[PDB]
Amino acid sequence: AQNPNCNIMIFHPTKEEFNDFDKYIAYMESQGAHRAGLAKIIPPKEWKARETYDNISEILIATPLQQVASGRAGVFTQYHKKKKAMTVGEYRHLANSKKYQTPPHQNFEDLERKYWKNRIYNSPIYGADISGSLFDENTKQWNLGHLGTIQDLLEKECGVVIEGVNTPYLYFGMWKTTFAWHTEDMDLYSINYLHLGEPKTWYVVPPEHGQRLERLARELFPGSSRGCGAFLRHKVALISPTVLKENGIPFNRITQEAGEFMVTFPYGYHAGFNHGFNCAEAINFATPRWIDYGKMASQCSCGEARVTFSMDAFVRILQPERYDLWKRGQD
Ligand SMILES: O=C(O)CNC(=O)C(=O)O
Ligand SMILES: [Mg+2]
Ligand code: NI
Ligand SMILES: [Zn+2]
Numbered sequence: 001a002q003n004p005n006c007n008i009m010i011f012h013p014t015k016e017e018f019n020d021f022d023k024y025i026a027y028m029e030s031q032g033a034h035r036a037g038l039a040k041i042i043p044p045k046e047w048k049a050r051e052t053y054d055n056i057s058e059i060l061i062a063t064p065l066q067q068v069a070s071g072r073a074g075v076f077t078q079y080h081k082k083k084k085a086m087t088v089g090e091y092r093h094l095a096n097s098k099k100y101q102t103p104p105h106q107n108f109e110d111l112e113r114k115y116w117k118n119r120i121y122n123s124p125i126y127g128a129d130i131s132g133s134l135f136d137e138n139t140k141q142w143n144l145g146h147l148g149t150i151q152d153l154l155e156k157e158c159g160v161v162i163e164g165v166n167t168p169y170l171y172f173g174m175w176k177t178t179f180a181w182h183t184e185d186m187d188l189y190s191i192n193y194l195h196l197g198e199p200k201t202w203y204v205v206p207p208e209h210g211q212r213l214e215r216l217a218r219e220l221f222p223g224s225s226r227g228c229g230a231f232l233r234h235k236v237a238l239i240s241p242t243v244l245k246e247n248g249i250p251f252n253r254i255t256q257e258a259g260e261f262m263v264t265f266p267y268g269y270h271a272g273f274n275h276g277f278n279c280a281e282a283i284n285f286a287t288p289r290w291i292d293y294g295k296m297a298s299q300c301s302c303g304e305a306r307v308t309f310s311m312d313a314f315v316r317i318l319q320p321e322r323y324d325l326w327k328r329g330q331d
Contacts, residue, residue: 002032006206008040008252009033015044018141022148025189025263025287034289036252037268038204041261043142049259050136053196056279057089059170061127064091067178069120074240075220076120078178083125088172088279091127095174095277100124102175102198102276108255112201115273116240119176127172134170134195134281142261144168144193144283151313153286160317164310168283173200173274180235181213181271183264185307186314187297188284190264192256198276200256203241207267209250213239216247228302235305238271266293294318301329 003009009031017024024041033039065080086094094100105111133145140146149166175198184190194200205213214232218225221237228234244251256262258278264270266289286294295318307330315326 002030003035004032006035006037006208006250006252008036008038008204008254010040010042012042013044015046015141018044018047021142022287028263029289033263034265034268035206035208036204037207037265038202038252038254038270039263039265040254040256041263043259043261047141049139049193049195050134053134053279056134057087057092059088059130059132061086061088061091061130061172064125064127066123066125068123069238071120073120074116074243076238077221077224077236078180078238079236080126081123088127091125091172091174092277094125100174108199108201108275111275115176115201116242119178119238119273122176124174124176124178126174126177127170130170130172131167132170133168134279142193144191144281147191147283147285150188150284150286151310153288153290154314154317157288157291158317162313162317164313166284166310168281171280171282173197173278173280175274175276177274178238179270179272181217181237181239181269182232182235183210183267183269183297184284185311186318187267187293188286188290189266190282190284192262192264192280192282194256194258194260195279195281196258197278198274199258200272200274200278200280201253202256202262202270202272203244203251203253204264205249205251205269207265210267210269212249213269216244216249228300228304230298230300231302231304232269233298233300233305266290267297291318299326299329301325303329306330
């Protein structure tokens, strides 16, 4: 078996290999990339997402989210407090202010130490889940707004047409902005392009060891676990690498820089933080290999998680038994 230690693999496709997205994902998995839960794809030098980022300041962040932490340095939850709308221009200025700016540091490792030491004592503001795209319409390769839809994949594989659409989201980040431990909705894949700015550091657990993370999570967030059998679907729980090591949870870490893609694989738990002002674009996608993961995916039915319109159909077709109880959590 390829990549038996579940290392995060880095790919350097040629511009020829960059034409066919599906085929390259399949290629990565033939080399065992999926065993890590996460991969890095460096685009060919010929490729550009768009000409410049000089004209993005007028994008509105309708609902910036202030990420307030509770708990201990290495084991904490976060909640999102809604703040007033601001433009990307205003957000960038806020990100660079003394209160919110990245501190002096030697290297990514030093910044990572500072993140886990001090994250809980601040509440950075995140522009997350903003519907939209920064890919030029003429960017033909790996354009996150032009991927085959999950609905079309489900139909190709299972013979059934379903409602739903699948569009990208933009994330404007600053120092310490944080994404909690999670898999994707319906344990889908995700792909994330870091368009501009400062890096994003990621942690990931191999899909074959996901349940180990879940078991640790139930022990570390015992109240949350009693409230919901899939409370990580709430995307609020953080566990540091030091704590994962102490508990023998297998994982890996890697820093994504501007101009690089990351792909998360089905049931690959991940979490991470941003190093300073940045902009990423992301979207879920599916392959034939996803179907079995979709069929087995845990669901939140306590009602916290509350998800996209499009997910109804996935649960309805793939998890008909769960569909009655799940949709009650949606309404
Ligand atoms: O960029 C972020 O904050 C979160 N992104 C993801 O979890 C993803 O792309 O799968
Ligand atoms: Mg603009
Ligand atoms: Ni994700
Ligand atoms: Zn729940």
